[PDB]
Protein backbone atom coordinates (compact mmCIF):
# COMPACT_ATOMS: atom_id res chain seq x y z
CA UNK A 1 0.00 0.00 0.00
CA UNK A 2 0.92 3.68 -0.50
CA UNK A 3 -0.59 6.37 1.73
CA UNK A 4 -0.54 10.21 1.46
CA UNK A 5 2.07 12.44 3.16
CA UNK A 6 -0.17 13.73 6.00
CA UNK A 7 -1.68 10.27 6.68
CA UNK A 8 1.81 8.79 7.06
CA UNK A 9 2.75 11.75 9.30
CA UNK A 10 -0.18 11.29 11.74
CA UNK A 11 0.33 7.50 11.85
CA UNK A 12 4.06 8.08 12.52
CA UNK A 13 3.10 10.60 15.22
CA UNK A 14 0.71 8.00 16.73
CA UNK A 15 3.44 5.34 17.07
CA UNK A 16 5.86 8.08 18.29
CA UNK A 17 3.31 8.94 21.01
CA UNK A 18 3.63 5.35 22.31
CA UNK A 19 7.26 4.30 21.78
CA UNK A 20 9.11 7.20 23.45
CA UNK A 21 9.75 7.53 27.17
CA UNK A 22 7.67 10.53 28.30
CA UNK A 23 8.09 13.07 31.23
CA UNK A 24 5.67 12.45 34.17
CA UNK A 25 3.89 15.85 33.94
CA UNK A 26 2.67 14.49 30.59
CA UNK A 27 1.32 10.88 30.80
CA UNK A 28 -0.33 12.33 33.90
CA UNK A 29 -2.83 12.80 31.08
CA UNK A 30 -4.12 9.58 29.37
CA UNK A 31 -4.38 8.21 32.94
CA UNK A 32 -7.86 9.67 32.70
CA UNK A 33 -11.38 9.40 34.17
CA UNK A 34 -13.25 6.18 33.28
CA UNK A 35 -16.55 5.78 31.35
CA UNK A 36 -19.08 5.78 34.22
CA UNK A 37 -17.61 8.76 36.10
CA UNK A 38 -17.18 10.70 32.81
CA UNK A 39 -20.86 10.13 31.92
CA UNK A 40 -21.86 11.13 35.46
CA UNK A 41 -19.74 14.30 35.33
CA UNK A 42 -21.55 15.29 32.12
CA UNK A 43 -24.98 14.38 33.52
CA UNK A 44 -24.31 17.30 35.89
CA UNK A 45 -22.36 19.55 33.45
CA UNK A 46 -25.11 19.32 30.77
CA UNK A 47 -27.53 21.07 33.17
CA UNK A 48 -25.35 24.20 32.92
CA UNK A 49 -24.95 24.87 29.20
CA UNK A 50 -23.94 28.51 28.72
CA UNK A 51 -26.90 30.22 27.07
CA UNK A 52 -26.28 29.89 23.30
CA UNK A 53 -26.07 32.99 21.05
CA UNK A 54 -29.59 32.43 19.66
CA UNK A 55 -31.13 31.83 23.13
CA UNK A 56 -29.42 34.93 24.56
CA UNK A 57 -30.55 37.06 21.59
CA UNK A 58 -34.23 35.97 21.80
CA UNK A 59 -34.39 36.42 25.60
CA UNK A 60 -32.83 39.90 25.54
CA UNK A 61 -35.31 40.93 22.83
CA UNK A 62 -38.02 39.55 25.15
CA UNK A 63 -36.67 41.88 27.86
CA UNK A 64 -36.96 44.79 25.40
CA UNK A 65 -40.43 43.90 24.02
CA UNK A 66 -41.85 43.59 27.55
CA UNK A 67 -39.97 46.03 29.83
CA UNK A 68 -40.07 49.06 27.47
CA UNK A 69 -43.90 48.85 27.26
CA UNK A 70 -45.20 47.26 30.50
CA UNK A 71 -35.59 40.68 40.63
CA UNK A 72 -33.93 37.70 38.86
CA UNK A 73 -31.09 35.77 40.59
CA UNK A 74 -27.60 35.43 39.07
CA UNK A 75 -27.71 32.38 36.75
CA UNK A 76 -25.15 29.62 36.97
CA UNK A 77 -23.20 28.18 34.04
CA UNK A 78 -19.95 26.29 33.41
CA UNK A 79 -16.83 28.44 33.09
CA UNK A 80 -14.67 27.68 30.09
CA UNK A 81 -11.62 29.79 29.18
CA UNK A 82 -8.05 28.89 30.21
CA UNK A 83 -7.30 32.46 31.30
CA UNK A 84 -10.56 32.34 33.27
CA UNK A 85 -10.21 28.81 34.72
CA UNK A 86 -6.63 29.44 35.95
CA UNK A 87 -8.06 32.72 37.26
CA UNK A 88 -10.84 30.85 39.13
CA UNK A 89 -8.46 28.22 40.42
CA UNK A 90 -5.93 30.12 42.71
CA UNK A 91 -8.81 32.30 43.80
CA UNK A 92 -10.36 28.96 45.00
CA UNK A 93 -13.59 29.68 43.16
CA UNK A 94 -13.42 26.27 41.52
CA UNK A 95 -15.10 23.13 42.89
CA UNK A 96 -14.58 20.91 39.84
CA UNK A 97 -12.12 21.71 37.05
CA UNK A 98 -12.31 19.50 33.97
CA UNK A 99 -9.17 19.27 31.81
CA UNK A 100 -8.94 17.89 28.26
CA UNK A 101 -6.26 15.22 27.59
CA UNK A 102 -5.80 16.11 23.89
CA UNK A 103 -4.56 19.70 23.42
CA UNK A 104 -2.90 21.01 20.20
CA UNK A 105 0.19 22.35 21.94
CA UNK A 106 0.55 19.97 24.94
CA UNK A 107 2.61 22.66 26.79
CA UNK A 108 -0.59 24.72 27.33
CA UNK A 109 -2.23 22.64 30.04
CA UNK A 110 0.80 20.89 31.68
CA UNK A 111 0.89 23.05 34.84
CA UNK A 112 -2.87 22.80 35.41
CA UNK A 113 -3.36 19.36 37.10
CA UNK A 114 -0.50 20.03 39.54
CA UNK A 115 -1.64 23.64 40.19
CA UNK A 116 -5.06 22.14 41.01
CA UNK A 117 -3.41 19.65 43.41
CA UNK A 118 -1.54 22.64 44.92
CA UNK A 119 -4.57 24.89 45.44
CA UNK A 120 -6.71 21.98 46.71
CA UNK A 121 -9.08 22.26 43.75
CA UNK A 122 -10.70 18.85 43.00
CA UNK A 123 -9.75 18.36 39.34
CA UNK A 124 -10.46 15.64 36.79
CA UNK A 125 -8.62 15.11 33.51
CA UNK A 126 -11.49 14.05 31.24
CA UNK A 127 -11.03 12.57 27.74
CA UNK A 128 -11.70 14.81 24.71
CA UNK A 129 -11.53 18.57 24.04
CA UNK A 130 -14.39 17.96 21.57
CA UNK A 131 -16.42 16.30 24.36
CA UNK A 132 -15.80 19.36 26.57
CA UNK A 133 -16.63 21.55 23.55
CA UNK A 134 -20.13 20.05 23.25
CA UNK A 135 -21.27 21.21 26.72
CA UNK A 136 -20.12 24.77 26.10
CA UNK A 137 -21.29 25.95 22.59
CA UNK A 138 -17.69 25.82 21.32
CA UNK A 139 -15.85 23.44 18.96
CA UNK A 140 -13.18 22.90 21.64
CA UNK A 141 -12.79 24.13 25.25
CA UNK A 142 -9.55 22.65 26.76
CA UNK A 143 -10.96 23.47 30.25
CA UNK A 144 -14.38 23.55 31.94
CA UNK A 145 -15.06 24.64 35.53
CA UNK A 146 -18.04 24.63 37.88
CA UNK A 147 -17.83 27.54 40.36
CA UNK A 148 -21.33 27.92 41.83
CA UNK A 149 -24.34 25.63 41.53
CA UNK A 150 -28.09 25.36 42.17
CA UNK A 151 -28.85 23.66 45.51
CA UNK A 152 -30.63 20.75 43.74
CA UNK A 153 -27.34 19.90 42.05
CA UNK A 154 -25.14 20.84 45.05
CA UNK A 155 -25.20 17.43 46.80
CA UNK A 156 -24.61 15.65 43.47
CA UNK A 157 -21.63 17.98 42.78
CA UNK A 158 -20.13 17.34 46.25
CA UNK A 159 -20.46 13.60 45.63
CA UNK A 160 -18.97 14.09 42.11
CA UNK A 161 -15.99 15.70 43.89
CA UNK A 162 -15.68 12.73 46.29
CA UNK A 163 -16.14 10.15 43.50
CA UNK A 164 -13.45 11.89 41.38
CA UNK A 165 -11.14 12.15 44.44
CA UNK A 166 -11.49 8.39 45.05
CA UNK A 167 -11.61 7.25 41.39
CA UNK A 168 -9.05 9.63 39.87
CA UNK A 169 -6.68 11.14 42.49
CA UNK A 170 -6.28 7.94 44.58
CA UNK A 171 -5.85 5.49 41.68
CA UNK A 172 -3.37 7.89 40.05
CA UNK A 173 -1.05 8.81 42.95
CA UNK A 174 1.57 6.75 41.07
CA UNK A 175 1.18 9.03 38.02
CA UNK A 176 3.18 11.90 39.61
CA UNK A 177 5.96 9.31 39.52
CA UNK A 178 6.74 6.93 36.62
CA UNK A 179 7.83 8.08 33.15
CA UNK A 180 5.19 6.80 30.71
CA UNK A 181 5.62 5.16 27.29
CA UNK A 182 7.97 2.21 27.89
CA UNK A 183 5.76 -0.04 25.72
CA UNK A 184 7.85 -2.67 23.88
Amino acid sequence: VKWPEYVRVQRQKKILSIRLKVPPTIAQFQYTLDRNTAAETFKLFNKYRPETAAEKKERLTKEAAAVAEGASPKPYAVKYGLNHVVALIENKKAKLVLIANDVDPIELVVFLPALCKKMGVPYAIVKGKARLGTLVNQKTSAVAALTEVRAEDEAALAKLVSTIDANFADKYDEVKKHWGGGIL
Binding site: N46, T52, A54, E55, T134, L135, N137
Partner: protein
Protein backbone atom coordinates in the same frame (compact mmCIF):
# COMPACT_ATOMS: atom_id res chain seq x y z
CA UNK B 1 -7.65 19.99 -41.95
CA UNK B 2 -5.78 17.41 -39.92
CA UNK B 3 -7.32 13.90 -39.90
CA UNK B 4 -10.16 14.10 -37.37
CA UNK B 5 -10.40 11.43 -34.65
CA UNK B 6 -13.13 8.92 -35.52
CA UNK B 7 -15.42 8.25 -32.57
CA UNK B 8 -15.74 11.79 -31.09
CA UNK B 9 -18.04 13.54 -33.59
CA UNK B 10 -21.59 12.67 -34.77
CA UNK B 11 -23.34 10.27 -32.38
CA UNK B 12 -20.58 10.73 -29.76
CA UNK B 13 -21.49 14.38 -28.96
CA UNK B 14 -25.21 13.84 -29.71
CA UNK B 15 -25.58 11.28 -26.90
CA UNK B 16 -23.99 10.49 -23.53
CA UNK B 17 -23.83 7.43 -21.25
CA UNK B 18 -25.55 7.45 -17.81
CA UNK B 19 -22.10 7.39 -16.13
CA UNK B 20 -20.99 10.40 -18.21
CA UNK B 21 -24.21 12.29 -17.35
CA UNK B 22 -23.84 11.60 -13.60
CA UNK B 23 -20.16 12.66 -13.66
CA UNK B 24 -20.83 15.81 -15.72
CA UNK B 25 -23.53 16.96 -13.29
CA UNK B 26 -21.36 16.11 -10.23
CA UNK B 27 -24.57 14.85 -8.65
CA UNK B 28 -25.47 11.52 -7.00
CA UNK B 29 -27.23 8.87 -9.14
CA UNK B 30 -30.35 9.10 -6.94
CA UNK B 31 -30.46 12.90 -7.31
CA UNK B 32 -29.67 12.57 -11.05
CA UNK B 33 -32.71 10.28 -11.32
CA UNK B 34 -34.80 12.60 -9.11
CA UNK B 35 -34.11 15.53 -11.47
CA UNK B 36 -34.72 13.18 -14.42
CA UNK B 37 -38.16 12.30 -12.98
CA UNK B 38 -39.04 16.01 -12.40
CA UNK B 39 -37.74 17.30 -15.77
CA UNK B 40 -39.29 14.44 -17.79
CA UNK B 41 -35.98 13.17 -19.18
CA UNK B 42 -35.61 9.63 -20.53
CA UNK B 43 -32.97 7.54 -22.33
CA UNK B 44 -33.06 7.84 -26.13
CA UNK B 45 -32.29 5.31 -28.88
CA UNK B 46 -29.60 6.19 -31.49
CA UNK B 47 -29.54 4.75 -35.03
CA UNK B 48 -26.03 3.44 -34.30
CA UNK B 49 -25.49 2.23 -30.72
CA UNK B 50 -21.73 1.70 -31.18
CA UNK B 51 -21.13 5.03 -32.92
CA UNK B 52 -23.01 6.54 -29.94
CA UNK B 53 -20.43 4.77 -27.76
CA UNK B 54 -16.71 5.18 -28.51
CA UNK B 55 -16.82 1.99 -30.65
CA UNK B 56 -17.89 -0.55 -28.03
CA UNK B 57 -20.81 -2.94 -28.25
CA UNK B 58 -21.81 -2.73 -24.58
CA UNK B 59 -24.98 -2.67 -22.42
CA UNK B 60 -25.40 1.14 -22.36
CA UNK B 61 -28.26 3.66 -22.00
CA UNK B 62 -27.96 6.93 -23.95
CA UNK B 63 -29.32 10.30 -22.90
CA UNK B 64 -29.63 13.33 -25.17
CA UNK B 65 -26.54 15.54 -24.85
CA UNK B 66 -28.35 18.90 -25.06
CA UNK B 67 -30.99 17.61 -22.57
CA UNK B 68 -28.45 16.90 -19.76
CA UNK B 69 -26.45 19.96 -20.93
CA UNK B 70 -29.66 21.96 -20.33
CA UNK B 71 -30.32 20.37 -16.90
CA UNK B 72 -27.00 21.71 -15.50
CA UNK B 73 -28.28 25.27 -14.93
CA UNK B 74 -31.46 24.80 -12.90
CA UNK B 75 -32.70 26.01 -9.46
CA UNK B 76 -33.74 22.49 -8.31
CA UNK B 77 -30.15 21.14 -8.50
CA UNK B 78 -28.94 24.09 -6.37
CA UNK B 79 -31.71 23.42 -3.83
CA UNK B 80 -30.65 19.75 -3.62
CA UNK B 81 -27.15 20.97 -2.67
CA UNK B 82 -28.76 23.24 -0.05
CA UNK B 83 -30.61 20.23 1.41
CA UNK B 84 -27.29 18.39 1.71
CA UNK B 85 -25.73 21.35 3.58
CA UNK B 86 -28.80 21.53 5.84
CA UNK B 87 -28.54 17.77 6.54
CA UNK B 88 -25.00 17.95 7.98
CA UNK B 89 -25.58 21.28 9.78
CA UNK B 90 -28.60 19.71 11.53
CA UNK B 91 -26.74 16.52 12.58
CA UNK B 92 -23.99 18.87 13.83
CA UNK B 93 -26.57 20.43 16.17
CA UNK B 94 -28.22 17.09 17.09
CA UNK B 95 -24.92 15.18 17.46
CA UNK B 96 -23.47 17.75 19.87
CA UNK B 97 -26.49 17.82 22.20
CA UNK B 98 -28.03 21.24 21.52
CA UNK B 99 -31.72 20.92 20.63
CA UNK B 100 -32.82 24.60 20.46
CA UNK B 101 -30.44 25.51 17.59
CA UNK B 102 -31.54 22.38 15.67
CA UNK B 103 -35.20 23.34 16.17
CA UNK B 104 -34.21 26.82 14.95
CA UNK B 105 -32.58 25.29 11.83
CA UNK B 106 -36.00 23.84 10.95
CA UNK B 107 -37.55 27.33 11.19
CA UNK B 108 -34.87 28.86 8.93
CA UNK B 109 -35.42 26.19 6.25
CA UNK B 110 -36.81 26.85 2.79
CA UNK B 111 -37.45 23.97 0.37
CA UNK B 112 -37.36 23.39 -3.40
CA UNK B 113 -40.57 24.13 -5.29
CA UNK B 114 -41.60 22.36 -8.51
CA UNK B 115 -43.36 25.46 -9.91
CA UNK B 116 -41.12 26.61 -12.80
CA UNK B 117 -40.41 22.95 -13.64
CA UNK B 118 -43.92 22.50 -15.10
CA UNK B 119 -43.91 25.73 -17.20
CA UNK B 120 -40.93 24.30 -19.13
CA UNK B 121 -42.51 20.80 -19.24
CA UNK B 122 -46.18 21.59 -19.99
CA UNK B 123 -46.23 25.20 -21.35
CA UNK B 124 -49.91 24.98 -22.37
CA UNK B 125 -52.77 23.88 -20.10
CA UNK B 126 -54.13 21.27 -22.63
CA UNK B 127 -50.68 19.60 -22.56
CA UNK B 128 -50.78 19.26 -18.75
CA UNK B 129 -54.22 17.61 -19.04
CA UNK B 130 -52.65 15.14 -21.51
CA UNK B 131 -50.23 14.11 -18.71
CA UNK B 132 -52.86 14.06 -15.92
CA UNK B 133 -53.79 10.59 -17.31
CA UNK B 134 -50.74 9.01 -15.63
CA UNK B 135 -50.71 11.60 -12.79
CA UNK B 136 -54.11 10.62 -11.33
CA UNK B 137 -53.24 6.91 -11.31
CA UNK B 138 -50.35 7.24 -8.81
CA UNK B 139 -52.27 9.66 -6.63
CA UNK B 140 -55.45 7.54 -6.34
CA UNK B 141 -53.30 4.50 -5.54
CA UNK B 142 -51.41 6.41 -2.80
CA UNK B 143 -54.73 7.41 -1.21
CA UNK B 144 -55.53 3.70 -0.74
CA UNK B 145 -52.31 2.91 1.16
CA UNK B 146 -51.50 2.13 4.79
CA UNK B 147 -48.74 4.49 6.00
CA UNK B 148 -45.42 2.73 6.63
CA UNK B 149 -41.92 3.77 7.76
CA UNK B 150 -41.31 4.38 4.02
CA UNK B 151 -44.28 6.74 3.54
CA UNK B 152 -45.54 9.19 6.21
CA UNK B 153 -49.22 9.84 7.05
CA UNK B 154 -48.94 13.51 5.98
CA UNK B 155 -48.01 12.29 2.46
CA UNK B 156 -51.11 10.04 2.20
CA UNK B 157 -53.47 12.64 3.78
CA UNK B 158 -52.36 15.34 1.30
CA UNK B 159 -52.65 12.89 -1.62
CA UNK B 160 -56.15 11.85 -0.47
CA UNK B 161 -57.07 15.55 -0.11
CA UNK B 162 -56.13 16.17 -3.79
CA UNK B 163 -58.05 12.99 -4.77
CA UNK B 164 -61.17 14.30 -2.99
CA UNK B 165 -60.73 17.71 -4.69
CA UNK B 166 -60.59 15.97 -8.09
CA UNK B 167 -63.65 13.80 -7.34
CA UNK B 168 -65.55 16.88 -6.06
CA UNK B 169 -64.89 18.91 -9.23
CA UNK B 170 -65.76 16.11 -11.70
CA UNK B 171 -69.01 15.56 -9.73
CA UNK B 172 -69.56 19.36 -9.62
CA UNK B 173 -69.31 20.40 -13.30
CA UNK B 174 -70.64 16.96 -14.41
CA UNK B 175 -67.79 15.63 -16.57
CA UNK B 176 -68.09 11.82 -16.80
CA UNK B 177 -68.59 9.79 -19.99
CA UNK B 178 -67.50 6.17 -19.41
CA UNK B 179 -67.11 3.80 -16.45
CA UNK B 180 -65.50 0.36 -16.28
CA UNK B 181 -65.31 -1.84 -13.19
CA UNK B 182 -62.54 -4.45 -13.52
CA UNK B 183 -60.66 -6.86 -11.21
CA UNK B 184 -57.85 -4.25 -10.93
CA UNK B 185 -60.12 -1.35 -9.88
CA UNK B 186 -62.63 1.06 -11.41
CA UNK B 187 -61.76 3.06 -14.55
CA UNK B 188 -63.27 6.45 -15.38
CA UNK B 189 -63.26 8.68 -18.46
CA UNK B 190 -63.71 12.44 -18.19
CA UNK B 191 -63.86 15.29 -20.74
CA UNK B 192 -61.65 17.71 -18.79
CA UNK B 193 -61.52 20.72 -21.14
CA UNK B 194 -62.70 18.35 -23.91
CA UNK B 195 -59.73 15.96 -24.20
CA UNK B 196 -60.96 12.73 -22.43
CA UNK B 197 -58.73 11.85 -19.45
CA UNK B 198 -58.65 8.26 -18.09
CA UNK B 199 -57.78 7.18 -14.53
CA UNK B 200 -58.02 4.18 -12.18
CA UNK B 201 -59.27 3.89 -8.57
CA UNK B 202 -58.62 0.69 -6.56
CA UNK B 203 -61.18 -0.98 -4.26
CA UNK B 204 -61.35 0.24 -0.64
CA UNK B 205 -59.70 -2.77 1.02
CA UNK B 206 -56.33 -2.93 2.86
CA UNK B 207 -53.53 -3.30 0.31
CA UNK B 208 -50.67 -5.73 0.90
CA UNK B 209 -47.48 -3.71 0.36
CA UNK B 210 -44.61 -5.82 -1.03
CA UNK B 211 -41.06 -5.25 0.26
CA UNK B 212 -40.02 -5.71 -3.39
CA UNK B 213 -41.25 -2.26 -4.56
CA UNK B 214 -39.08 0.83 -4.08
CA UNK B 215 -40.88 3.58 -2.14
CA UNK B 216 -38.29 6.24 -3.00
CA UNK B 217 -38.82 6.28 -6.77
CA UNK B 218 -42.62 6.40 -6.28
CA UNK B 219 -42.36 9.19 -3.69
CA UNK B 220 -40.68 11.56 -6.22
CA UNK B 221 -43.31 10.78 -8.86
CA UNK B 222 -45.90 11.55 -6.17
CA UNK B 223 -43.95 14.76 -5.40
CA UNK B 224 -44.09 15.91 -9.05
CA UNK B 225 -47.69 14.78 -9.80
CA UNK B 226 -48.88 16.32 -6.49
CA UNK B 227 -47.69 19.86 -7.37
CA UNK B 228 -48.88 19.38 -10.98
CA UNK B 229 -52.35 18.53 -9.63
CA UNK B 230 -52.38 21.57 -7.30
CA UNK B 231 -51.79 23.89 -10.29
CA UNK B 232 -54.26 22.02 -12.53
CA UNK B 233 -56.98 22.23 -9.85
CA UNK B 234 -56.37 25.96 -9.27
CA UNK B 235 -56.68 26.54 -13.05
CA UNK B 236 -59.89 24.47 -13.31
CA UNK B 237 -61.66 26.00 -10.28
CA UNK B 238 -60.67 29.64 -10.98
CA UNK B 239 -61.64 29.39 -14.68
CA UNK B 240 -65.10 27.82 -14.82
CA UNK B 241 -66.02 26.83 -11.26
CA UNK B 242 -65.26 27.65 -7.67
CA UNK B 243 -62.94 29.10 -4.98
CA UNK B 244 -59.71 27.15 -4.35
CA UNK B 245 -59.12 25.60 -2.00
CA UNK B 246 -62.66 24.77 -0.70
CA UNK B 247 -63.26 24.13 3.01
CA UNK B 248 -64.48 20.88 4.62
CA UNK B 249 -67.17 20.37 7.27
CA UNK B 250 -65.63 18.79 10.38
CA UNK B 251 -68.71 16.77 11.45
CA UNK B 252 -69.15 15.65 7.81
CA UNK B 253 -65.53 14.42 7.68
CA UNK B 254 -66.26 12.58 10.96
CA UNK B 255 -69.14 10.68 9.29
CA UNK B 256 -67.83 9.73 5.80
CA UNK B 257 -64.39 11.32 5.12
CA UNK B 258 -65.25 10.84 1.42
CA UNK B 259 -67.23 12.88 -1.11
CA UNK B 260 -70.53 13.83 0.61
CA UNK B 261 -68.19 15.72 2.95
CA UNK B 262 -65.97 18.61 1.68
CA UNK B 263 -68.57 21.28 0.74
CA UNK B 264 -67.63 23.67 -2.10
CA UNK B 265 -69.09 27.10 -3.00
CA UNK B 266 -69.14 28.80 -6.43
CA UNK B 267 -68.41 32.53 -5.91
CA UNK B 268 -75.78 20.10 -19.61
CA UNK B 269 -73.84 19.50 -22.88
CA UNK B 270 -73.74 15.67 -22.68
CA UNK B 271 -76.60 13.10 -22.21
CA UNK B 272 -74.70 11.50 -19.27
CA UNK B 273 -74.73 14.87 -17.43
CA UNK B 274 -78.53 15.02 -17.91
CA UNK B 275 -79.21 11.43 -16.72
CA UNK B 276 -80.51 10.60 -13.19
CA UNK B 277 -81.94 14.14 -12.81
CA UNK B 278 -84.89 14.14 -10.37
CA UNK B 279 -83.88 10.67 -9.10
CA UNK B 280 -83.03 9.92 -5.46
CA UNK B 281 -80.98 6.76 -4.79
CA UNK B 282 -80.76 4.97 -1.44
CA UNK B 283 -77.34 3.29 -1.45
CA UNK B 284 -77.38 0.34 0.96
CA UNK B 285 -74.60 -0.91 3.28
CA UNK B 286 -73.51 -3.84 1.05
CA UNK B 287 -72.15 -1.86 -1.94
CA UNK B 288 -68.96 0.25 -1.83
CA UNK B 289 -70.19 3.85 -1.47
CA UNK B 290 -67.25 6.12 -2.48
CA UNK B 291 -66.90 4.36 -5.86
CA UNK B 292 -70.66 4.73 -6.55
CA UNK B 293 -71.82 8.01 -4.94
CA UNK B 294 -69.32 9.83 -7.19
CA UNK B 295 -71.24 8.52 -10.24
CA UNK B 296 -74.72 9.33 -8.88
CA UNK B 297 -73.74 12.92 -7.95
CA UNK B 298 -71.88 13.33 -11.28
CA UNK B 299 -74.86 12.44 -13.49
CA UNK B 300 -77.55 14.23 -11.42
CA UNK B 301 -78.92 11.89 -8.75
CA UNK B 302 -78.97 12.11 -4.95
CA UNK B 303 -77.43 9.88 -2.26
CA UNK B 304 -78.74 8.70 1.11
CA UNK B 305 -76.61 5.96 2.70
CA UNK B 306 -77.05 3.23 5.31
CA UNK B 307 -73.60 4.26 6.62
CA UNK B 308 -74.59 7.87 7.52
CA UNK B 309 -77.14 6.68 10.13
CA UNK B 310 -74.43 4.82 12.10
CA UNK B 311 -88.56 9.81 1.80
CA UNK B 312 -88.09 10.87 -1.88
CA UNK B 313 -86.06 7.67 -2.53
CA UNK B 314 -87.04 6.03 -5.85
CA UNK B 315 -84.27 3.41 -6.24
CA UNK B 316 -82.33 1.18 -3.82
CA UNK B 317 -78.96 -0.40 -4.70
CA UNK B 318 -78.59 -3.74 -2.86
CA UNK B 319 -76.18 -6.71 -3.21
CA UNK B 320 -77.82 -9.55 -1.24
CA UNK B 321 -79.27 -12.91 -2.44
CA UNK B 322 -82.15 -12.39 0.03
CA UNK B 323 -83.60 -8.87 0.33
CA UNK B 324 -85.68 -8.23 3.46
CA UNK B 325 -87.99 -5.18 3.27
CA UNK B 326 -89.43 -5.09 -0.31
CA UNK B 327 -91.65 -1.95 -0.42
CA UNK B 328 -93.90 -0.91 -3.34
CA UNK B 329 -92.41 2.62 -3.47
CA UNK B 330 -88.80 1.73 -4.36
CA UNK B 331 -87.16 -0.06 -7.31
CA UNK B 332 -84.49 -2.65 -6.45
CA UNK B 333 -81.23 -2.76 -8.40
CA UNK B 334 -77.80 -4.42 -8.43
CA UNK B 335 -75.19 -1.65 -9.25
CA UNK B 336 -74.41 -3.14 -12.71
CA UNK B 337 -77.43 -1.09 -13.95
CA UNK B 338 -75.59 2.17 -13.08
CA UNK B 339 -72.40 0.82 -14.73
CA UNK B 340 -74.42 0.27 -17.94
CA UNK B 341 -76.51 3.48 -17.80
CA UNK B 342 -73.31 5.58 -17.87
CA UNK B 343 -71.78 3.61 -20.79
CA UNK B 344 -74.84 3.63 -23.09
CA UNK B 345 -76.41 6.91 -21.88
CA UNK B 346 -79.90 5.71 -22.85
CA UNK B 347 -81.14 4.43 -19.43
CA UNK B 348 -81.06 0.60 -19.78
CA UNK B 349 -84.17 -1.32 -18.45
CA UNK B 350 -83.79 -2.66 -14.88
CA UNK B 351 -85.47 -6.01 -15.76
CA UNK B 352 -82.08 -7.73 -16.12
CA UNK B 353 -80.76 -6.22 -12.85
CA UNK B 354 -83.06 -7.54 -10.07
CA UNK B 355 -81.54 -8.62 -6.69
CA UNK B 356 -81.08 -12.42 -6.77
CA UNK B 357 -80.40 -13.12 -10.47
CA UNK B 358 -77.27 -13.38 -12.70
CA UNK B 359 -76.04 -10.16 -14.34
CA UNK B 360 -75.43 -9.52 -18.11
CA UNK B 361 -71.81 -10.10 -19.39
CA UNK B 362 -70.72 -6.42 -18.77
CA UNK B 363 -68.74 -5.30 -21.85
CA UNK B 364 -65.90 -2.74 -21.87
CA UNK B 365 -66.45 0.72 -23.43
CA UNK B 366 -63.34 -0.03 -25.56
CA UNK B 367 -53.35 -21.47 -53.25
CA UNK B 368 -52.45 -18.72 -55.76
CA UNK B 369 -51.35 -16.34 -52.97
CA UNK B 370 -48.98 -19.10 -51.77
CA UNK B 371 -47.79 -19.32 -55.41
CA UNK B 372 -47.36 -15.52 -55.85
CA UNK B 373 -45.07 -15.58 -52.78
CA UNK B 374 -42.14 -16.48 -55.06
CA UNK B 375 -41.50 -13.15 -56.85
CA UNK B 376 -41.08 -11.24 -53.56
CA UNK B 377 -37.63 -10.34 -52.21
CA UNK B 378 -36.34 -11.47 -48.78
CA UNK B 379 -37.02 -7.96 -47.37
CA UNK B 380 -40.66 -8.52 -48.38
CA UNK B 381 -40.98 -12.27 -47.66
CA UNK B 382 -39.86 -11.71 -44.04
CA UNK B 383 -42.41 -8.89 -43.58
CA UNK B 384 -45.32 -10.66 -45.35
CA UNK B 385 -44.78 -13.86 -43.33
CA UNK B 386 -44.75 -11.74 -40.15
CA UNK B 387 -48.04 -10.04 -41.10
CA UNK B 388 -49.56 -13.45 -41.91
CA UNK B 389 -48.52 -14.79 -38.47
CA UNK B 390 -49.90 -11.67 -36.70
CA UNK B 391 -53.32 -12.11 -38.34
CA UNK B 392 -53.19 -15.88 -37.68
CA UNK B 393 -52.49 -15.42 -33.94
CA UNK B 394 -55.50 -13.05 -33.76
CA UNK B 395 -57.95 -15.19 -35.78
CA UNK B 396 -57.09 -18.42 -33.91
CA UNK B 397 -57.74 -16.60 -30.60
CA UNK B 398 -61.08 -15.43 -32.06
CA UNK B 399 -61.76 -19.11 -32.87
CA UNK B 400 -60.85 -19.91 -29.23
CA UNK B 401 -63.50 -17.43 -28.01
CA UNK B 402 -66.10 -18.97 -30.36
CA UNK B 403 -65.27 -22.58 -29.35
CA UNK B 404 -65.36 -21.67 -25.63
CA UNK B 405 -68.70 -19.84 -26.09
CA UNK B 406 -70.16 -22.99 -27.70
CA UNK B 407 -68.74 -25.30 -24.99
CA UNK B 408 -70.23 -23.09 -22.23
CA UNK B 409 -73.65 -22.44 -23.91
CA UNK B 410 -74.29 -26.23 -23.91
CA UNK B 411 -73.99 -26.26 -20.09
Amino acid sequence: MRIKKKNTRGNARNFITRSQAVRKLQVSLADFRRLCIFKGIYPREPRNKKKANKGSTAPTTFYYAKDIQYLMHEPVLAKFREHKTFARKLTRALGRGEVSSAKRLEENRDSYTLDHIIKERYPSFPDAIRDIDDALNMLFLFSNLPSTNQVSSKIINDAQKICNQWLAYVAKERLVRKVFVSIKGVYYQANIKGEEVRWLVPFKFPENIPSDVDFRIMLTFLEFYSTLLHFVLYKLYTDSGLIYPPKLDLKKDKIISGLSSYILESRYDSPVASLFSAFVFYVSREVPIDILEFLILSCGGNVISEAAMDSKVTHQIVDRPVLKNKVAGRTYIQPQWIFDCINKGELVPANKYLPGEALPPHLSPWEEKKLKMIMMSNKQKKLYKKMKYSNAKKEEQAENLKKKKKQIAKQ
